[PDB]
Design an enzyme around this catalytic site. Structure first.
Site, PDB file in Angstrom:
ATOM      1  N   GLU A 187      -3.053  42.160  31.704  1.00 20.04           N
ATOM      2  CA  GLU A 187      -2.660  42.773  30.444  1.00 20.04           C
ATOM      3  C   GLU A 187      -1.512  43.752  30.651  1.00 20.04           C
ATOM      4  OE1 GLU A 187      -6.230  44.726  29.632  1.00 20.04           O
ATOM      5  OE2 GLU A 187      -7.244  43.028  28.671  1.00 20.04           O
ATOM      6  N   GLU A 383      -7.580  36.618  21.782  1.00 22.58           N
ATOM      7  CA  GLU A 383      -8.547  36.333  22.832  1.00 22.58           C
ATOM      8  C   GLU A 383      -9.763  37.221  22.631  1.00 22.58           C
ATOM      9  OE1 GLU A 383      -8.003  37.005  27.397  1.00 22.58           O
ATOM     10  OE2 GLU A 383      -7.886  34.859  26.939  1.00 22.58           O
TER      11      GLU A 383
END
Length: 440
Positions: A187, A383
């Site tokens: 991320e 997600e």
């Protein structure tokens, strides 16, 4: 039933499922092809559109620089092709375990860890001198410290190798997108909440700007502002598990909103923005014509405070007075990338039962980030963790992918998730995500 499941006459949103973490071993061999066929059979039975394939830097460029091993992934892509599934490719420049053990252990390349033994400053470093061994510090982006290459060159070279090896798959339509896995967990963020260093929710995390290369950058930035004493990281920001009120940096009226604090947070978040900006320019070069995806985290604890400490240490300069996502998303828009937002992850009750009194707002953060992206014309991928038998968790994902409140019918471009009890509900969810009538 479990959740209201009438999404008919809504867009078809493709669903992608993750694969087992240890599907390919440390020597880049498919561990069990027939097991892969068995899992892919079940996914097709659910109407899942495709799979998420994590390509690990430590597996592919394992032993010596500029030598890449792809055979396991070639084999896996071949099997997936047999099942007529799409592929979301993720290029992971990190190890596993930033959050905890996990199924298998996948490290950075052995040859990187060897370099680290003589130069610990290639890792993100905290104020206490601890090194995060899960990925490379952005401080070495332009530093020729990796056996003759820079941090950027190693990432670029890896991407070019994937494209040389797999250009056909994108042309065939097998690969839908390619996700650049930037930080310690893939991320876009500093590794401000390391589990291995003792962070527990809802700790504010720590600034990760203490390796000697980032400190040199910070020193130059301070001198160019005319403030030699600004060449420092905050010393009153507490620790990984502090609460913001008990810190001089993050408390109401604290130093995060001083001349120095604004300088430091602009520098800190600017280093993040510059890192992604430079990597995406080369990712477009390496993968001409492919959809590029970047993943952003959901740092929602302390969101209901002035200083948003947890976002700040993760590298998003988002305060009650400053939008920290729109500048990042403007930069993403200039690269034509798709934003993947991690929504409603595992262990979500860190605030259902706000036993931790975390001043959190998961829903509010989610919709600030989504609206910031749509304000940019950034396409949105979602997600999420998949529940088993919580109808409200299922509807939350569906009502986030298919917002309903938006006039332009802004749906997510895709949804990805990481006992026939859960299977039946999951099957109903996929039909909802596809906009189909759910029965049978």
């Amino acid at each position: 039933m479990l959740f209201p499941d009438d999404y008919t006459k809504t867009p078809y949103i493709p669903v992608y499922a993750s694969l087992p973490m240890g599907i390919i071993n440390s020597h880049c061999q498919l561990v069990d092809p027939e097991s892969v066929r068995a899992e892919l059979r079940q996914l097709k039975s659910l109407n899942v559109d495709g799979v998420v394939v994590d390509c690990w830097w430590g597996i592919v460029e394992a032993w010596t620089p500029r030598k890449y091993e792809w055979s396991g992934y070639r084999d896996l892509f071949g099997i997936i092709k047999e099942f007529k599934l799409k592929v979301q490719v993720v290029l992971s420049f990190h190890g596993s375990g930033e959050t905890g053990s996990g199924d298998v252990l996948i490290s950075l390349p052995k040859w990187i860890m060897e370099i680290a033994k003589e130069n610990q400053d290639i890792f993100f470093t905290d104020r206490e001198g601890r090194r995060n061994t899960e990925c490379l510090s952005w401080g070495i982006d332009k530093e020729r410290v990796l056996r003759g290459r820079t941090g950027i060159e190693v990432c670029f070279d890896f991407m070019r190798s994937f494209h040389m090896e797999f250009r056909n798959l994108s042309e065939e339509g097998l690969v839908s997108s390619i996700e650049i896995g930037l930080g310690a967990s893939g991320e876009l963020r500093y590794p401000s909440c390391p589990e291995t260093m003792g962070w527990k929710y809802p700790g504010i995390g720590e600034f990760q700007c203490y390796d000697r290369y980032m400190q040199k950058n910070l020193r130059q930035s301070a001198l160019s502002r005319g403030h030699l004493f600004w060449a420092r990281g905050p010393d009153n920001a507490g620790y990984y598990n502090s609460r913001p009120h008990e810190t001089g940096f993050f408390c109401d009226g604290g130093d995060y909103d001083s001349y120095y604090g604004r300088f430091f947070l602009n520098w800190y978040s600017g280093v993040l923005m510059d890192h992604v900006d430079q990597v995406l320019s080369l990712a477009t070069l390496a993968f001409d014509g492919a959809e590029i995806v970047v993943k952003v985290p959901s740092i929602y604890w302390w969101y209901r405070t002035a200083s948003h400490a947890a976002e700040l240490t993760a590298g998003f300069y988002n305060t009650t007075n400053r939008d920290g996502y729109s500048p990042v998303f403007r930069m993403l828009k200039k690269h034509s990338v798709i934003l993947k937002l991690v929504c409603y992850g595992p262990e979500y009750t860190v605030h259902e039962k706000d036993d931790d009194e975390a001043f959190a707002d998961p829903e509010g953060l989610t919709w600030q980030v989504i609206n910031a992206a749509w304000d940019q014309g950034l396409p949105l991928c979602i997600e999420s963790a998949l529940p088993c038998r919580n109808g409200e968790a299922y509807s939350r994902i569906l009502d986030t992918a298919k917002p309903r409140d938006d006039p332009d019918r802004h749906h997510a471009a895709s949804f990805a998730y990481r006992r026939e009890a859960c299977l039946s509900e999951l099957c109903t969810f996929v039909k909802c995500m596809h906009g189909e009538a759910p029965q049978n």
